[PDB]
């Protein structure tokens, strides 16, 4: 089906928001994620059923729409910000606590703490010299931000999102991640164990989602590996010999711009890319613990519940064997000539 | 290495107890199980280390050495006895409670309850008419046995075996299985979750044991299948395409005769065959719950502990998925392109 559809027209006859040439080329088909008003009952139905939807008029982060580098540098305060650096467009996430389990893992991206003004300078320096280096700032908002940013944060639409939280029975807000990336940056496919309202502020991002029932096509790393929850498949060069069912994957996609909010349901794979030649992108996300597991488990199980079972089996085995490295060999022994 | 070794000579110059032609031919090599006196400290060391050993002079079932069909029929009472019938020499065990999980399983042997005199008659009838049918009586001894059998049972060497139980920290005696089989009968390879003193009374049995670390060569059925704990491999015609590591199996074997006692340690595979043209065989076994799991688990784990982990993973998955049939598919999804 159609991907992100015919690009939308910006108000005031300012032209297409983007064009087809700013999207990367991939081997799988996609269908559109619906774009709806928050007052549309169809939108409530999709969130209730833990399916993705783009909400166009929440005003969730309305005061942040004026944000840019100059404003943020002046007001975001003098705290440290985590900035990842890579020699490729792909910024693969890795859990630094798990790197002891796997000594042979060498991450491609590197995390350096720095002040926001040092981050602006680096971008400025790279642009000036035409360097191929790439940066991606990913920092959770905290009490150290300046007074202007506090006022902006206070002005978010807490009325609307607090109502969502209550209606869905979610846990509490765990964090807001500030994401500032360069044109063309890619966060490879992965799933998160929390509910996410993804609030776009500056520039455009193409978001490709896959439902939890496509676990078998996306080949996550082992739970103890640093890249737990990330797909092993290289979307730019898929190894069909190792990952044959990636030939059957089908996604849902959309392009979000300033003012849009994308509901990424817990456990849904998402691949996120800042449009080529689109300038810098700014996103703030909202993460909520999922609702509690119901006391009366209902069969048949949902896909995400089976994912959770597999994660726990892997976790338990690592603890019982005393070493994560032995998990694979034991699982193989368990199924070979018995279940396969 | 040598199998059961050069056959032993019966006292009084009564000739070899058996000869090589009464043993079935198999594709794997074997080494001998040691034959020792119960007063030999090497025997105590083997039992302590949960390794098999044949004890030649325990007198464990001394009063039962006079047992034969005529004596048993006269004195074993009028209780029911479980008698399995098969059109082959292989009597594969199946758990009748688990047959609901697997509707497509049709056992080769059949269980019929009957009185001991009806069992003798059937054997007599089969022999008289030269029929190819085979019978194997397997019944646990209970309070219904006649007064003579009680006196015999009371005369077992409880002093010796109770000391073993205490020295090894085992649980209590769970049962004694009376086994009466025809020449050539085979109980295919399987492991039991209890400690076993295997007391031979009449005739000769060839016992082939495999340590728990050969799990990967012996391919047990799934834990929810009726033949849980039995090897899927047909020893008479091994399918090396399905069971490739059966080409690496190596066993320990011995031939036990009247008065011998074989320690079969918990979790050790054993294949047991009544010698061809050897007449009927009579065995009584003693089963004891294993010692409790130590509170401080010690790494590295032993092979049998890894077996227990695999069993529990399978059991838990069946319960959490609500159906044993889904265990295989989920395990496959878990490892394919991830751990294999």
């Amino acid at each position: 089906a159609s991907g992100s559809g015919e690009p939308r027209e910006e108000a005031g006859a300012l032209g297409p928001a983007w064009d087809e040439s700013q999207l990367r080329s991939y081997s799988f088909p996609t269908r559109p994620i619906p774009r709806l008003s928050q007052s549309d009952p169809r939108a409530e139905e999709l969130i209730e059923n833990e399916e993705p939807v783009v909400l166009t008029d929440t005003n969730l982060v309305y005061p942040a729409l004026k944000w840019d580098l100059e404003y943020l540098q002046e007001n975001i305060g003098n705290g440290d910000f985590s900035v990842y650096s890579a020699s490729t467009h792909k910024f693969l996430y890795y859990d630094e606590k798990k790197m002891a389990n796997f000594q042979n893992f060498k991450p491609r991206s590197n995390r350096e703490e720095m002040k926001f003004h040092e981050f602006v300078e680096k971008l400025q320096d790279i642009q000036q010299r035409g360097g191929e280096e790439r940066l991606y700032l990913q920092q959770t908002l905290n009490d150290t931000v300046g007074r202007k940013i506090v006022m902006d944060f206070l002005g978010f639409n807490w009325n609307w999102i607090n109502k969502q939280q209550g209606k869905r029975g979610w846990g509490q807000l765990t964090s807001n991640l500030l994401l500032i990336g360069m044109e063309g940056n890619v966060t490879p496919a992965h799933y998160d164990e929390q509910q996410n309202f993804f609030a776009q502020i500056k520039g455009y991002k193409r978001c490709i989602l896959f439902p939890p029932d496509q676990f078998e096509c996306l080949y996550p790393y082992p739970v103890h590996h640093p890249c737990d929850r990330q797909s092993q498949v290289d979307f730019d060069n898929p190894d069909y010999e190792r990952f044959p069912n990636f030939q059957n994957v089908v996604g849902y996609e959309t392009v979000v711009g300033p003012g849009d909010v994308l509901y990424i349901p817990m456990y849904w794979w998402h691949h996120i890319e800042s449009l080529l030649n689109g300038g810098i992108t700014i996103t703030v996300n909202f993460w909520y613990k999922g609702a509690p597991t119901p006391k009366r488990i209902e069969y048949p199980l949902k896909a995400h519940q089976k994912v959770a079972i597999m994660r726990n089996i892997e976790k338990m085995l690592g603890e019982a064997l005393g070493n994560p490295q032995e998990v694979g060999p034991l699982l193989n022994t368990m199924i070979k000539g018995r279940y396969n | 290495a040598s199998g059961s070794g050069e056959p032993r000579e019966e006292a009084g110059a009564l000739g070899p107890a058996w000869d090589e032609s009464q043993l079935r031919s198999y594709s794997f090599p074997t080494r001998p199980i040691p034959r020792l006196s119960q007063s030999d400290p090497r025997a105590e060391e083997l039992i302590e280390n949960e390794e098999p050993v044949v004890l030649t002079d325990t007198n464990l079932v001394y009063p039962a050495l006079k047992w034969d069909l005529e004596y048993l029929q006269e004195n074993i009472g009028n209780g029911d006895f479980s008698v399995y019938s098969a059109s082959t020499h292989k009597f594969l065990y199946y758990d009748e409670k688990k047959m609901a999980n697997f509707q497509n399983f049709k056992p080769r042997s059949n269980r019929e309850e009957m009185k001991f005199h009806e069992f003798v008659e059937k054997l007599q009838d089969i022999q008289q008419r030269g029929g190819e049918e085979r019978l194997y009586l397997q019944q646990t001894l209970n309070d219904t046995v006649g007064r003579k059998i009680v006196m015999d049972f009371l005369g077992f060497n409880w002093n010796w075996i109770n000391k073993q139980q205490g020295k090894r920290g085992w649980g209590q005696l769970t049962s004694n299985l009376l086994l009466i089989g025809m020449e050539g009968n085979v109980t295919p390879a399987h492991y039991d979750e209890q400690q076993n003193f295997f007391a031979q009374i009449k005739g000769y049995k060839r016992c082939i044991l495999f340590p728990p670390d050969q799990f990967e060569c012996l391919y047990p059925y799934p834990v929810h299948h009726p033949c849980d704990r039995q090897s899927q491999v047909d020893f008479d015609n091994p399918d090396y395409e399905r069971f490739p590591n059966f080409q690496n199996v190596v066993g320990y074997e011995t031939v036990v005769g009247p008065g011998d006692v074989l320690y079969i340690p918990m979790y050790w595979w054993h294949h047991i065959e009544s010698l061809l043209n050897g007449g009927i065989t009579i065995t009584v076994n003693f089963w004891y719950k294993g010692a409790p799991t130590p509170k401080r688990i010690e790494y590295p784990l032993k092979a049998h502990q890894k077996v227990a982990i695999m069993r529990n993973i399978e059991k838990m998955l069946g319960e959490a998925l609500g159906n044993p049939q889904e265990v295989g598919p989920l395990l496959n999804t878990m490892i394919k392109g991830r751990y294999n």
């Binding site: 995390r111 765990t174 992965h190 164990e193 737990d228 929850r229 993460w287 959770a308 079972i309 | 998955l317």
Partner: peptide
């Protein structure tokens, strides 16, 4: 059964 299905809370944030 309830223990196995219990979800976690891990996200891409260092």
């Amino acid at each position: 059964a309830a223990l196995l299905i219990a979800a976690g809370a891990d996200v891409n944030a260092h």
